[PDB]
Amino acid sequence: MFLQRPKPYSDESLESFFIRVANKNGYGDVHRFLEATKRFLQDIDHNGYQTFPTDITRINPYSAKNSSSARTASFLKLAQLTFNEPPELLGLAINRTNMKYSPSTSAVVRGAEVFPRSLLRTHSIPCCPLCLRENGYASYLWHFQGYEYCHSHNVPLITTCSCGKEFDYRVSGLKGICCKCKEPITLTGHEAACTVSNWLAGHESKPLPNLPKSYRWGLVHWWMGIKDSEFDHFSFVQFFSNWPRSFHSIIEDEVEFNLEHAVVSTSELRLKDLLGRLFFGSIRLPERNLQHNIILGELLCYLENRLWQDKGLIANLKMNALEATVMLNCSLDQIASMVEQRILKPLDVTDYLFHFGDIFCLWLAEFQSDEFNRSFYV
Amino acid sequence: MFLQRPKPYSDESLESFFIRVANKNGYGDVHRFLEATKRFLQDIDHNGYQTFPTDITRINPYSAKNSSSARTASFLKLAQLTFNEPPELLGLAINRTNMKYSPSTSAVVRGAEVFPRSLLRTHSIPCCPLCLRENGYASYLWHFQGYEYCHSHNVPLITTCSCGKEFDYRVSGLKGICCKCKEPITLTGHEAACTVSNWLAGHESKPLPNLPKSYRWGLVHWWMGIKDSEFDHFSFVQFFSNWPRSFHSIIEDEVEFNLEHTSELRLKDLLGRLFFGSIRLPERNLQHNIILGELLCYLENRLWQDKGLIANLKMNALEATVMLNCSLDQIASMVEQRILKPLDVTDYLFHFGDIFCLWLAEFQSDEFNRSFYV
Ligand SMILES: [Zn+2]
Ligand SMILES: [Zn+2]
Ligand SMILES: [Zn+2]
Ligand SMILES: [Zn+2]
């Protein structure tokens, strides 16, 4: 099998890539192209040729249950032999990863952008009938929640055509011709999400900060837990006009509430009981790089400064051997090694034996890194 | 107690900070200030006042046995109480850190710059008396080997004066007046170390790459294991001078010594020195750990060449966690569900053509990922 590469684009999705290859090389559709792709992998002695799907829906590496390792091994072999010039297809596929958010939100990766798994769309993919006729391809941002508006047009994406039927570009082509009435879809102008859709594109909008593509998705899963609802876009804009003093407006509310509503005495207080929501909700977004995770990197500033104010209230919060490992970015064995030789002053892991100012000052002298340290937010 | 901040600098050592305070504010030497400082912590009931040193040698937080957590806890109080405008003292200390190098070298950290533990000077700190008269304070680079020449005057660093006696700023102040002679010290041109110490400082100097301060210092440990000797400043410049074909020139010769010394060949038997000595130096940022990405770019275009020679090189489950940056529990999890294909942990049932395809599918990150060396 000898193919030709179409016009390359760094923002084209994976499902939009196989459609443009089959239309350029004279194939009928994408279903007959993936069937001939499976036939070529059988002839070249591939290990997972029988697991290659013929559907454009499950062509992504996260849809594979156990054959994910043979999926990109099939993707790497096609880029080296079936084209005159080697394309870039591994950077366009959504790969799984072991990276988690706080407290337990899973995440995936696509090249140099770590996507949240919880913000991935799986029911219906929206699209735009303008970019599919001007750019000639589909954006990779159409598969995720949050990119509700088209970024440089001040229009939303479409979900249902004028005759009651939906349009999905994966099953009905990249032109924009719907299934039932075979017409182009009529469109259905704010700023509250046009600021967001410009910012979730990876681009600059003020006052929202300059961050990598992964670390702008990290604010979105966090801010949904703030409202305890779905994402609100205009309150996202107004919240960072007072950055960080709207986040300073939050932590003042959160320590002053749970001291009132403390059920135990002020010496028997725990870190999870005063600040179990704020501190355990910003650790890995996606990592502990406080140079880009500005949430925890600011949270540390409003924790270190007031430590020994108010009789050392914050610096004396009880902690387990469990949540000592969460803050230090270590394991339970390194806690159990520092109770033998007593670098760390004191085993039951779930019995509250430690203090917060003890664990906070241990990080600053024994457990920093080139990203998770005190010297970026200062 | 109530003091004054001097002119604050972005390269002052920590030992120079307790002399520029102790001279200015009416103490006799550095010993008097440390003795006064320890008592102060007793009055405000700090827990580790009894571990606070009266020696300026052991002032750094790695010199503590168990009280390194209470030494920066002693340091987190003085910047808030005993001054007018808070000085930067935690940004000057040499803290420990857990960032292991290749193969097992530990690390220390001073703010946002991580150093090899094996490159710390401990006998006698060389210095430049021209910075000890015009700047008058001690640059933190003087605490480390690899830095031999002063990069601000192109003049060497002194270790033994004209009377056969040494010189150190922790015992002879910051003026430059020695012990035996109490004179100005008589001084002691190259380029090969001059441009390294300009690169070791944190400026842009060619042909040494634009790496960060954590990664400009991760290479000097790596090259001394290559030559297996003391550090030659001449060859460390000329090694980077023909990138990539000087770095590849050892690589294509590493295989030829180890091909002759074919399926029972291993990745530890054929590419064992280049790969296992380059994973974390200090970390896995392939934008700035250029050693792995260029070797991966060498070995991505060598995966199924030579009838798949490099695809047939054997790996364990222990040395697969070194690559994939995971634990042994996730390795045994991929054996039950059978994503990675062949329990004995040190078993040779895993090959390099099998591991590298799994990392492009299930184990990327934002820094240990293919998205830089494309
Ligand atoms: Zn567009
Ligand atoms: Zn229509
Ligand atoms: Zn000088
Ligand atoms: Zn002398």
Numbering used by the authors:
A (entry chain J): 1 to 188, 193 to 350, 360 to 391
B (entry chain I): 1 to 188, 193 to 265, 270 to 350, 360 to 391
Article sentences:
Recently, bioinformatics analyses have revealed the presence of CRISPR–Cas loci in bacterial Tn7-like transposons, thereby implicating a functional relationship between RNA-guided DNA targeting and transposition, with the latter representing a new role unrelated to host defense. Support for this concept has emerged from recent functional studies on type I-F and type V-K effectors involved in sequence-specific DNA transposition, thereby significantly broadening the potential biological applications of CRISPR–Cas technology. To complement the available functional studies, our efforts have focused on structural studies of the Vibrio cholerae Tn6677 multi-subunit type I-F CascadecrRNA–TniQ complex, whereby transposition subunit TniQ initiates DNA transposition with the eventual help of other transposition-associated proteins TnsA, TnsB and TnsC in the gene cluster. Here we report cryo-EM structures of a V. cholerae type I-F CascadecrRNA in complex with transposition subunit TniQ before (binary CascadecrRNA–TniQ) and after (ternary CascadecrRNA–TniQ–dsDNA) target double-stranded DNA (dsDNA) binding at an average resolution of 2.9 Å and 3.2 Å, respectively.
Our CascadecrRNA–TniQ–dsDNA ternary complex contains a G–G/C–C PAM (protospacer adjacent motif) sequence, which is required for binding of the target sequence, allowing CRISPR–Cas systems to discriminate between self and non-self. The target sequence contains 12-base pair (bp) of PAM-proximal duplex DNA and 51-bp of PAM-distal duplex DNA. We could observe only 5-bp of PAM-proximal duplex DNA with 2-nt overhang at the 3′ end of the non-target strand (NTS), and a traceable 32-nt target DNA strand complementary and paired to 32-nt spacer RNA, but no clear density for the PAM-distal duplex segment, which is adjacent to bound TniQ. The G–G/C–C PAM is specifically recognized by Ser127 and Asn246 in Cas8. Arg243 forms a wedge and stacks with PAM G (–1), facilitating the formation of crRNA–target DNA heteroduplex and displacing the NTS, thus leading to the onset of R-loop formation. In line with this concept, we observe that TniQ forms a head-to-tail dimer whose individual monomers simultaneously bind to Cas6 and Cas7.1 of the CascadecrRNA complex, with clear density observed at the interface between TniQ and both Cas6 and Cas7.1. One TniQ interacts with Cas6 via a main chain polar interaction between Val268 and Asn16, whereas the other TniQ interacts with Cas7.1 by multiple polar interactions between side chains over a larger interface (inset). Notably, the binary and DNA-bound ternary CascadecrRNA–TniQ complexes superpose with an RMSD of 2.33 Å. Minimal conformational changes are observed on ternary complex formation in the presence of bound target DNA, reflecting slight opening of the entire complex and crRNA, especially within the TniQ-bound end.
